Amino acid sequence: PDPMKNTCKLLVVADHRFYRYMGRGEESTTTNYLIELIDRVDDIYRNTAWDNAGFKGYGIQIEQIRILKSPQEVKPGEKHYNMAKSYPNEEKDAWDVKMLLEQFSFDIAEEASKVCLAHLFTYQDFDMGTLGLAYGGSPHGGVCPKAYYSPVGKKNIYLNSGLTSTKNYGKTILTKEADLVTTHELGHNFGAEHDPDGLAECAPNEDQGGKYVMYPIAVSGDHENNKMFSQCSKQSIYKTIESKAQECFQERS
Numbered sequence: 001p002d003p004m005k006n007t008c009k010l011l012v013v014a015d016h017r018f019y020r021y022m023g024r025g026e027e028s029t030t031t032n033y034l035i036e037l038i039d040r041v042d043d044i045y046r047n048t049a050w051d052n053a054g055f056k057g058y059g060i061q062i063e064q065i066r067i068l069k070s071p072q073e074v075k076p077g078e079k080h081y082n083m084a085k086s087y088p089n090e091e092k093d094a095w096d097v098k099m100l101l102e103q104f105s106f107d108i109a110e111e112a113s114k115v116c117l118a119h120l121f122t123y124q125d126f127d128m129g130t131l132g133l134a135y136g137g138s139p140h141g142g143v144c145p146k147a148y149y150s151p152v153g154k155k156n157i158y159l160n161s162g163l164t165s166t167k168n169y170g171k172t173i174l175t176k177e178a179d180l181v182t183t184h185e186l187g188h189n190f191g192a193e194h195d196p197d198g199l200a201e202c203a204p205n206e207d208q209g210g211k212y213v214m215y216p217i218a219v220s221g222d223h224e225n226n227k228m229f230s231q232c233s234k235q236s237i238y239k240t241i242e243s244k245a246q247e248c249f250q251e252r253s
């Protein structure tokens with residue numbers, strides 16, 4: 001590993017919903033929550049041996065936190081990931097999650113071009129139990145900005161993005177659950193796909209430590225494997241990492 005290129009620096013964005021409902025309308029409470037979360041996720045990454053040997057020490061650090069204290073005012077017909085209303089249905093608590101990720105990536109494009117990853121932290125109840133979403137590791141995008149020309153947006157956006165909501169089914173999720181969401185989405189960013197039932201090594205039973213973090217169904221977090229990457233994830237990311245590290249990773253602060 002290259003100690004000058006072992007860290008994926010993040011632009012972390014807290015939208016007005018997160019500021020209000022997790023941050024208590026305070027900058028300090030908002031930034032402390034995120035700093036602590038990313039540091040705990042970093043512990044997972046940094047300790048992961050991508051080959052099962054000496055290939056560990058890769059992780060994540062926050063470069064900047066943008067704190068949006070109030071909604072983005074918009075004109076009729078215009079949308080923005082930080083606007084007051086949900087889209088496409090203003091009557092729902094939350095956006096359609098795929099549309100929200102696309103919109104965030106559009107709005108943050110200038111900033112996203114200058115960082116390894118951008119991640120949106122929000123507080124809205126996505127339909128049917130969804131907690132987050134990311135580009136990369138889908139059967140493209142992920143670490144290091146990769147351009148996509150949006151025919152609808154009429155400009156390049158970058159696919160180095162993901163999001164986490166800390167609201168689900170009308171309440172704030174546990175911190176131990178929040179850590180898992182952000183680890184999972186960053187896992188896609190690093191190149192992992194979902195762990196399949198058909199590979200027992202990558203999706204163990206409850207009495208063998210339970211599921212690993214890239215399982216498609218939320219790992220509740222009290223089982224041994226829940227906060228670890230499966231061997232499937234490791235192999236996938238291992239192809240990602242060194243290449244991408246040279247491309248956009250920096251020295252750990």
Ligand SMILES: CC(C)C[C@H](CC(=O)NO)C(=O)N[C@H](C(=O)N[C@@H](C)C(=O)NCCN)C(C)(C)C
Pocket residue numbers: 128129130131132133134168180181184185188215216217218219
């Ligand atoms: C951290 C989790 C694993 C993220 C995934 C979504 C995902 O794959 N993002 O990259 C999720 O929200 N999964 C949901 C999930 O497991 N939600 C749990 C909390 C849930 O609703 N459990 C009860 C069944 N409705 C789904 C969509 C499967 C319902």
Ligand SMILES: [Ca+2]
Pocket residue numbers: 124125126127128129130131167168169
């Ligand atoms: Ca939800």
Ligand SMILES: [Zn+2]
Pocket residue numbers: 184188194216
């Ligand atoms: Zn996923």
